[PDB]
Structure formats: structure tokens, C-alpha cells
Design a protein around this ligand. Structure first.
Ligand SMILES: OC[C@@H]1O[C@@H](O)[C@@H](O)[C@H]1O
Ligand SMILES: OC[C@@H]1O[C@@H](O)[C@@H](O)[C@H]1O
Ligand SMILES: OC[C@@H]1O[C@@H](O)[C@@H](O)[C@H]1O
Ligand SMILES: OC[C@@H]1O[C@@H](O)[C@@H](O)[C@H]1O
Ligand SMILES: OC[C@@H]1O[C@@H](O)[C@@H](O)[C@H]1O
Ligand SMILES: OC[C@@H]1O[C@@H](O)[C@@H](O)[C@H]1O
Ligand SMILES: OC[C@@H]1O[C@@H](O)[C@@H](O)[C@H]1O
Ligand SMILES: OC[C@@H]1O[C@@H](O)[C@@H](O)[C@H]1O
Ligand SMILES: O[C@@H]1[C@H](O)[C@@H](O)OC[C@@H]1O
Ligand SMILES: O[C@@H]1[C@H](O)[C@@H](O)OC[C@@H]1O
Ligand SMILES: O[C@@H]1[C@H](O)[C@@H](O)OC[C@@H]1O
Ligand SMILES: O[C@@H]1[C@H](O)[C@@H](O)OC[C@@H]1O
Ligand SMILES: O[C@@H]1[C@H](O)[C@@H](O)OC[C@@H]1O
Ligand SMILES: O[C@@H]1[C@H](O)[C@@H](O)OC[C@@H]1O
Ligand SMILES: O[C@@H]1[C@H](O)[C@@H](O)OC[C@@H]1O
Ligand SMILES: O[C@@H]1[C@H](O)[C@@H](O)OC[C@@H]1O
Ligand SMILES: [Co+2]
Ligand SMILES: [Co+2]
Ligand SMILES: [Co+2]
Ligand SMILES: [Co+2]
Lengths: 249, 249, 249, 249
């Protein structure tokens, strides 16, 4: 019975309700942002999230993202910043995670993010140690805070527990807290607590998001290198693939 | 009678009410963000805004800014991006402009901004033509849209009308609109309409904001060059000075 | 295939998402308010609303109601008001209607309501003529406004079109409008437009709501007569029954 | 220097900012609701609240009220309820109280209220004992909860401390709490804590509010008796007078 896709009705009710929730929270969601790419399921074996549904509280890797901005910010840059432009830019999006579900372990080589919880609470799991990039020196300034150890009893997705091993630091964010920064080159993941009465709704403000997705394939590249450039490295292999497209039957 | 400062009571009621308005709108305002640097008056001759008050509807250059984030985003960058890092980073802030008042004509060589109106309506005045930087070539991708001509009857601040001459393009932004981008090296200004029943409240998401201000003098510089680096170029000379400090008696 | 009930999963996702939407809108929803009585389906033949779902846009009679208050307001009343107390009291509730769905034609002999749209838009259908009560004289003061004729093309629920015949007046309410009053003894109904991108969310402030429901059977009666007193008269017979309980399988 | 009035500028900034705060919180405030009757000062000696201002945190009796509804609910009533109609009706309003300020001790013979905190926190002081009405028997059902004793260190307005003596019960209400009912014939008062970073904003849903005020003198009476009927009995004599009008110079 292992689900291999999500029905059109399951997808629409999930995404359309989330868009309404976002609008209720005053996030500027336009019509084009509500599409078949908004609802993400990280891997075929994660489609089972819909066996019992988004309110089951079960641990699965899936989420909704409504992106209001992803500005290259290339205009006005001295030509010499061409090779480093990919680390800048501005991406603003609203992310919705239901109870128990996760935005799976992953890291970005270029994108640095920041979180602002709007509704619910966000449990962030991450490695305070930055990853290295063979052959290249890297700058340091603030680095990541050590945080706290994981709380007891966190249910991880079946068959993906190991992908979380290195994300030893934990922090729980709430509405009204100071903005939290997730520096690039740091493994991170997050979920909405299983007992939450509401979906987790978080506003992410980060640098440009390099994603050669389906709802992406068609735009013009600001800088040659950017074309087909990917910057979302998921720890679990089964997550990097099913991420670029949602199977809707 | 030309006011030369703002009284402690005038300042607190202006800034504390604005902070409450921001909180009502769910913007994450922390205690340290509500300080004596939040309320800005651009020039001694602009203190007359307080002769009749922030609800007079009169044209003056003053505003409130609550900055929740100003992240250098230097961590994880290849050492080669050191000289171009100043063009990136992440700055999130809530700006409050009362009826008739303006965020005066100015431009940034490094900072690219984006606007999201939360409450009220925002009238943006800008030059669709980017400024040049002697001796350096610059990248181009999207540039700025031409916009529309100014609507009839815009009252400008007395003695500062000329600073607006080059900002020929106009656009009126409302809550729910697509995010609007103001590329770096473009002259821009904005105001809250004089007949607005509410202050204009806008969320700005931009690259790092280089400002060697009073509430700034004391931090550590992520990159040597950044120290004392200024990136807010106001057209009116009387605006670049009184911007770094508010005279409260 | 005519549905005869709603599955536990269908019910929970419908009601739990609505509760989250309400909370997003700051309505004070407590845990006990989110129960198996919140989601209402007016008649067995209306369960087909779940054949295609709450986002199908199809015309069916069903809605969600989260009641925060239903105060008899009997305390402090002179004993002589005992027989007229049933016309007073205070009932505050949040009602959520999905696109195309209706709160079916009905009237109350005692309850006078008022509407405040919080999200979406509300299309109210009603009779400007008050109903009569055989043998009893009634007071008049403001009466109901005549309103406008129905807009063209309103899709009514299959097999229930006639129940709307007498509700000739129409009015479309939006967020920010003046409070709208629906005097007792007036036939009324309302729906969320089929093309709405969001569920209709309305705050109703009315006099006491006499409803001997399932989630009601168990309380103490403030005044003898009130016991088992019903005040929700639906035009369609198939609506008065299936209203007191939702079949969840 | 004892202030004897409030200047036009002081009044407008106080009331216009409050209206904007209300709108930010989605309360349906129309243009006519923002008038010279919205800002209330209970007594000439309370005008000193403006010596240091609404953010001084000092104890004074003053508040702002934006009434969206005050429906007699007389239509549809059997003629026999004419003498008891004054106890019913529907009044919806948003009340704004700044830090340290109070809605002074008082009681209503007819009006029963309910509170829903929208922003900030509300400290309610009241007598759990209902007042008696010479010669008339009264109904009882739920009565008022006993509550808790006052917290230590509540600063009361100078010269009005005694008016609070009988309001022995205390309860602190927050956003999201169950609706709180204040039965008619109970002495009550409330304030916004002095250390609050935001004004207290509360939505009150009560029965009809009988107030022959300035912004009232001119309407038609639904029932003869109602004409000139007053239902706001303040413990302090200096409060019952200056309540019907605000001295603006
Ligand atoms: O609201 C837009 C539509 O809704 C979503 O379900 C997408 O399929 C898109 O086609
Ligand atoms: O609350 C929704 C329902 O309850 C959970 O147990 C899931 O199985 C889903 O079917
Ligand atoms: O809320 C913080 C205080 O309020 C503002 O007026 C600043 O002066 C700061 O000292
Ligand atoms: O609305 C506030 C008052 O009205 C305006 O005319 C200003 O002078 C200010 O004093
Ligand atoms: O949140 C409370 C639960 O949710 C609803 O589905 C009801 O069944 C109730 O049991
Ligand atoms: O948008 C939700 C889907 O679309 C509608 O057509 C319904 O059938 C439902 O299955
Ligand atoms: O917004 C309406 C005006 O504002 C308030 O100050 C009242 O004086 C009223 O005249
Ligand atoms: O915060 C506003 C100022 O501070 C308080 O002390 C008042 O005196 C007022 O003038
Ligand atoms: O051991 C816990 C978890 O199972 C692991 O994946 O990450 C660290 C945490 O403390
Ligand atoms: O857009 C998403 C966001 O930037 C964050 O959650 O990381 C994963 C993905 O890129
Ligand atoms: O002429 C108008 C204005 O006075 C000037 O400053 O900018 C262009 C606009 O059309
Ligand atoms: O912080 C402010 C913002 O970035 C924008 O308004 O430009 C001026 C100033 O820097
Ligand atoms: O004819 C329309 C509708 O079919 C009827 O039920 O109510 C009046 C409206 O104009
Ligand atoms: O609670 C509901 C509300 O009072 C209104 O919609 O009428 C029907 C029902 O009683
Ligand atoms: O004594 C305290 C207060 O001074 C009085 O007015 O009300 C009761 C409270 O406990
Ligand atoms: O309108 C106000 C409200 O009803 C409550 O605070 O009591 C005093 C006044 O009548
Ligand atoms: Co990420
Ligand atoms: Co700028
Ligand atoms: Co009704
Ligand atoms: Co009262």
C-alpha cells in the first residue's frame, strides 16, 4: 500500500489551505505562488505521509514553500563580483510544516538563511561545525552558536534516522524571538512539534536560492555559471531527487 | 520658533507607539530595537515636523526603523569574495512613516532593497536610470522598471523640493502586492500619503546595511574594509548629517 | 456512491485546519472548542460535499463553527424578565465557510445576529420581510434594509434550490465594513463565493443561541423554559435534522 | 499647573494612533468611529494624565473606546418584553488602555459584558458580590467567580484609591484565554500593567450600552423608557460627569 504519489485532491487541499493560512498571516502570496511546485515531498517513500494525512502527526519529510522573492541582486555589482554573486541575492519565502513533519537534513554551499517564526514553534536541528570545501580557504566571523542538546523523544522518519546523526545542536524558536541565522555550509533540518495544534509557519529570509526546479526551468540566468547551479545538498540521497518534482495523480 | 530638537516625551510617544504598532502586525521587535536611534529626523530643519506633530500630515523628512536583522553573511565565503562581501548580507527591518512624511531622496552603492507593505500604502519615487561608478564596469540583468509619472499634487518638504528632481518614476505599493525591488545605485525616496488614516508600515528585506551610526559604533567589523563604511548617500546634504543621531532634549 | 458520512481523516483535516486558520486570525479558540460538533453538514445528502472535497467549489450546505461564548446573561435580571430572557444573552463565534458552500436558509424566533467578516467575502441572502408569530404583537424599530437583488449566476445546492426562493435580498460583506445586523424572525443564508482563494471567515456576535445539540446535551438550564428550547428553524427539512450531529466514520 | 483639558494635538495623536493600532489588529473601525468622543478622561483632575503623557506609566483614569456596534435588538420582540429590552441588545467595541491607566470602578444595572484581550494583558478588579436593587427580586444562575486577591503593589490614581476598596477580586486576562464575563450589577474596573510595552487592547462584547452622551444625543429611542437612560454608574463622583465629554482646547 506504500503510496507512490499524492492525489490531485490531497495536493490541492494541502496547498490551498496553506496559502489561505499564509494570507491570514499577512504574507504576500500571489496567484502564481500557489502552484504544483509549492507542496514538496522529499522522496517516493515519503508519500506515505498521505496514507494517514498531514494531521496524523507522523514523522515524514514534506513541506510547503511559498516564495515571494528570489532576487539575484546582480544589477549594480562590479564585474569583479561575478564569481561571488551566487553567494548573495535575496530570497523571501513562507514555509509551512505540519505536526511531526520535517524539512530534512541538508546544507547549502552558498545560501545563508534566517528564520522568523510566524505561527507555531520551530525545532531546528543542526551541526555547529561548518563543512569544508576542498582546496578553498573560507572566511569566518560569527560562526554558529553551539545551542542545546536534542530534547528527549524526537521521532524521526522511518529509514532516514541516520541522516540526522551529525545535526547534534538543537534550538526551539518561537514567534517574537530574535531572528535566527543559519550560516551556509552548516547541516540543518527542522520540524513542527508533533503535538502542535497548528502547522509551523516560518518566514525565511536568505541569500539567493539556486534551484534548477520544474517551476524554475525556463528563466534567464543573470550570470552564466548560475545556469543549472544547485545549492541544496540533502544528506539523504532519496531526498535530493524527489525534491525537484511532486507526483500528483 | 524653528524646532532644533525633539523632547523626550515627543520621542518616546512616537517610537513606543510605533513599536506597539509593529508588534500588533507581528513584526518581531525585541527590547533592544526600541531605542533612541529608532526615530530618525533627516536634518535640523526637519525637527519642525514636531511643531504640529506626526499626524499633521505636513511634508517633512523623518521616519522610524526597527531593524531585526543585519547579517554580514561573511561566514562560509571563499576568501576571494572578501572585497565583494559588502554587497551581500541580509538586513530585515520594519519602517514606519507617518502621513505626508518621507524617507528622503538617496541611493546606495552596495545595498539592494525590496519592499513589502504591511499597513497603509507606499508611494515610491525613483530614477529608473542607475548611477555610474567612475572607473568600474558594472553588471546588468533586470535593471529597474520605468514605472509611471508622478501623480498630481505631491507636497514636498520646504527647502528640499530640488532633491527629488531626478526621481522621475513613481509606483504606489499596497499590502499583498508582489515584492518590489530597488536595485543598488538607484536614487529613491518614498512617503506615506498625507490623507492616510494609518502610518505606512513597510517591511524591507535588503542586503547588508553599512551605517556607522551611534547605535552602531561599538561592534566588530567582519571584514577590515567594512569598518566606517557608509552606504547611504542622501541627495540633500542636510540629510546625511542629522541622520546619524536624533537630538532629544 | 452518494456519501452518507465523513471519514475521521476528512473531518479532522477540515476542522483542525480551520481551527489553525482561526488562531492565525487571532480568534480565541480553546481546546474544547475543537471537537466533533464543530464541523456541520446539513443533511445526509450534503455529505457528498466530501466526494470532491471542501476546495471543489461545489454548492453544498456545510460549515464550521467555533463558539467562544454563549452566555445566558440571566444573572442580575429582574424576575419579571424570565420569559423574555431567551431573546437576550451573548453568543460569540467564528464561522468558516469554504468556497461555494452555504450556511443554509433558516431563521430564528429569538436570536438576532451581527456579522464581521475577518477573511474572504460573505454573500448574504435574506428576506427583508420579518416573519409573523401567530397571536403575538411584536416591536419594530429599525427593521431590515432592503439590500440589492441577487447577482447573476449563483449556484445553489442540488435539491435545495427552492429553500432560497424567499431570501430575495442580497448584500456582499467584506473585512472592514460596518457591522451587519440580521434581526431575529428574518430568513437568511450566506455563502463564500466559489472563486474565493480563501475560506470565508466571519465573526458572529448575536444573542443567546438555543441549540439542544450533542455537544450541548449535558449543561444546566438557567431558566426552566430554555431546556430543550430550539431556535434554529431551517427552511429545508433535511437540514434541521442532520444539523444536531455529524456522522464520522 | 494641574491640566484642565487636552490640546487638539494631544487628543488627535492619542486617538488617531489608537485607531491605527485597532486597524492593525483587524478591528473594523470606520471613519465615524474616530471622533472627539472616542478618547475619554474620567474627571477634570484626570487631565493631568497628559502632563507627562500616555506613555508615562502613571496611574490615571482614561481610555479610548471605538464602538462598532450598539444594536437595541428590539425588532422581533414580543411587546411584553418592552420593559426588559434594556437588558439585552448587542454592543461590540474595542477599548484601548495605556500602561498604568484605568477604566475606573463602576457598575451597570443592565449591561453584562465579556472581554477578549487582543493585545497586551488586562488586569480586572471586581466585586464577586452582586449589588442589590431595592424592591426587586433578581435571577441567579452562574454568578461571578471569586478570582484571586490583588497582586502586590498596584498603583491607584491619586485621590481615587478609595473607589477601588470593594473591588476585592482580581484576574489577569491574556490573548487566547476563554472569554471572561462581567455580569451586570457587579462593581468592576481594569487597567493595563504599568510595565507593558504595548497598550492594552480589548474587545468587549456586551448587551446594549445605555449612554446619553454627546456623540449620542441625537438618535431615535427604540423604546420610550430608553430615552435619557443611563447605565454606567461610577463609584467616584468625579468620574460620572467628565465622562460624557472630553475638553479639547
Ligand atoms: O491556486 C492555483 C492552483 O492551486 C494549486 O493546487 C495549483 O495546482 C494551482 O494550479
Ligand atoms: O487528525 C487526522 C487523522 O488523525 C490521525 O491519526 C491521522 O490518521 C488522520 O487520519
Ligand atoms: O523601550 C526602550 C526605550 O524606549 C525608547 O524611548 C528608548 O528611549 C529606549 O530607552
Ligand atoms: O491631527 C493632529 C493635529 O492636527 C494637525 O493639524 C496637527 O497640527 C496636529 O496638531
Ligand atoms: O483537537 C481536538 C480534537 O480534534 C477534532 O478532530 C475533534 O475530534 C477533537 O477530538
Ligand atoms: O482543488 C481541490 C480539488 O479540485 C476540485 O475540483 C475538487 O474536485 C478537489 O478534488
Ligand atoms: O479621524 C476623524 C477625526 O480624528 C479625530 O481626532 C476626531 O477629531 C475626528 O474629527
Ligand atoms: O516615555 C514617555 C515619557 O516618559 C515618561 O516618563 C513620561 O514622562 C513621558 O514624558
Ligand atoms: O543522538 C541524538 C540524535 O539521535 C542524533 O541523530 O543527533 C544527536 C542527538 O543528540
Ligand atoms: O527553499 C528552501 C529554504 O531555502 C530552506 O528551507 O532550505 C531548503 C530550501 O532551499
Ligand atoms: O516634476 C515632478 C517632480 O516635481 C520632480 O521632482 O520629479 C518628476 C515629477 O514628475
Ligand atoms: O535602513 C534604511 C533602509 O535600508 C532604506 O530605507 O534605505 C535607507 C536606510 O538605509
Ligand atoms: O430569483 C433569485 C433566486 O433564484 C431566488 O431563490 O431568490 C431571489 C433571486 O433573485
Ligand atoms: O450558530 C449559528 C449562528 O448563530 C448563525 O449562523 O445561525 C445558525 C447557527 O445558529
Ligand atoms: O486591599 C487591596 C486594595 O487596596 C483594595 O482597594 O481592594 C482589595 C485589595 O486587596
Ligand atoms: O462602553 C464601556 C464598556 O461597556 C465598559 O468598559 O463599561 C464602561 C463603558 O460603558
Ligand atoms: Co536550508
Ligand atoms: Co534606501
Ligand atoms: Co442564523
Ligand atoms: Co463596565
Amino acid at each position: 500500500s506504500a503510496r507512490t504519489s499524492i492525489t490531485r485532491r490531497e495536493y490541492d487541499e494541502w496547498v490551498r489551505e496553506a496559502a489561505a493560512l499564509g494570507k491570514a498571516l499577512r504574507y504576500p502570496i500571489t496567484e502564481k505562488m500557489v502552484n504544483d511546485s509549492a507542496g514538496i515531498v522529499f522522496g517516493a517513500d515519503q508519500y506515505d505521509a498521505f496514507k494517514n494525512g498531514m494531521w496524523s502527526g507522523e514523522p515524514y519529510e514534506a513541506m510547503i514553500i511559498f516564495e515571494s522573492l528570489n532576487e539575484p541582486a546582480v544589477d549594480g555589482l562590479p564585474t569583479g563580483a561575478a564569481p561571488y554573486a551566487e553567494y548573495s541575492g535575496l530570497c523571501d519565502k513562507l514555509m509551512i510544516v505540519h505536526p511531526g513533519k520535517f524539512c530534512p537534513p541538508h546544507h547549502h554551499g552558498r545560501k545563508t538563511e534566517s528564520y522568523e517564526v510566524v505561527l507555531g514553534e520551530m525545532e531546528v536541528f543542526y551541526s555547529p561545525t561548518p563543512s569544508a570545501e576542498s582546496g578553498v580557504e573560507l572566511l569566518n566571523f560569527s560562526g554558529m552558536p553551539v545551542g542545546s542538546p536534542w530534547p528527549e523523544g524526537v521521532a524521526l522518519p522511518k529509514g532516514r534516522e541516520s541522516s540526522y546523526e551529525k545535526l547534534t545542536s538543537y534550538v526551539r524558536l518561537r514567534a517574537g524571538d530574535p531572528k535566527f541565522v543559519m550560516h551556509r555550509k552548516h547541516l540543518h533540518a527542522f520540524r513542527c512539534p508533533p503535538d502542535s495544534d497548528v502547522p509551523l509557519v516560518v518566514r525565511e529570509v536568505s541569500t539567493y536560492s539556486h534551484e534548477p526546479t520544474e517551476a524554475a526551468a525556463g528563466n534567464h540566468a543573470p550570470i552564466p555559471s548560475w545556469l543549472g547551479m544547485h545549492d541544496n545538498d540533502f544528506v539523504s540521497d532519496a531526498a535530493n531527487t524527489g525534491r525537484l518534482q511532486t507526483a500528483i495523480s
